[model samples]
Target: GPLGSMDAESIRLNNENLWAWLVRLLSKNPEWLSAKLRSFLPTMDLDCSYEPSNPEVIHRQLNRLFAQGMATWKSFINDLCFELDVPLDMEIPLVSIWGPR
Candidate 1:
C-alpha cells in the first residue's frame, strides 16, 4: 500500500517535534505545568511544597524526569512498532493524530 517508510531516525525526529510542541503548549498553559508537577512529585519523594529557589534547579529536575519518561515511552513505542511491522513514519502519524478526532 506504500503507506510510508518507518525507521529509527524518523521516530526520533518525530519525538523531538512532539516534545517541542508540548513544551510550547505547557509554557502557554500553566495548568498543564501544574498538573505535570503534581503528577511527577510522588516519584521524587517530595511534595508540591518542595520548591527550589533557582529556576535552573527546577529545569534540571524536569529535564531528568522528561528524559526518563521519554526512554520508557520510546521503548514501548519501539516494541509496538516491531510487533505491527510498521515503518516509523507511518507510526508517527497514526500516533500523533490518533485521538485528534
Candidate 2:
C-alpha cells in the first residue's frame, strides 16, 4: 500500500521480491483478485471476464495489461493491500524469503 510513498531509489529495493509476492498471491488466492477485479481492469488497460482458476485466460488478460504500459505491478499490490487491508505480517515473510536479493 506504500507505492506512491516511495521514490525511484526506494522502489529499486525489493522490486523482485514484490513481484514474486504478487504472482504467488494471485496464484494462491484468486478470490482476493476477483473481489476487486473490475475496479482495476481499466487501470491495467485490461478488459475482460474470466474465471480466476483459468490461468490461460488470466495470463492473456494480464499480458494485454502489461503490454499496454500498465507500469508498477507494485501499485496493484498497493491498492490491494490498502483496499483489502492486508496485514503486513502476512506479507512480510513473502518479501523476506530472499531478503531483497
lDDT (10s digit) by residue, model 1, range 11-77? 4344445444444443454444444444454455324435442344434445544555554333434
Q: How many backbone clashes does candidate 2 have?
A: 0
- Give stretches of model 1 more than 4 Å off: 1-12, 43-61, 67-101
C-alpha TM-score for every candidate: 0.33, 0.43
- In model 2, the Cα lDDT at residue 73 comes to 42
Q: Which lDDT tens digits does candidate 2 get at residues 27-63?
A: 6766666555545555642335555446555455445
Give the best candidate by lDDT: 2
- Candidate 2, clashing residue pairs? none
Worst lDDT run of 10 residues, candidate 2, spans 90-99
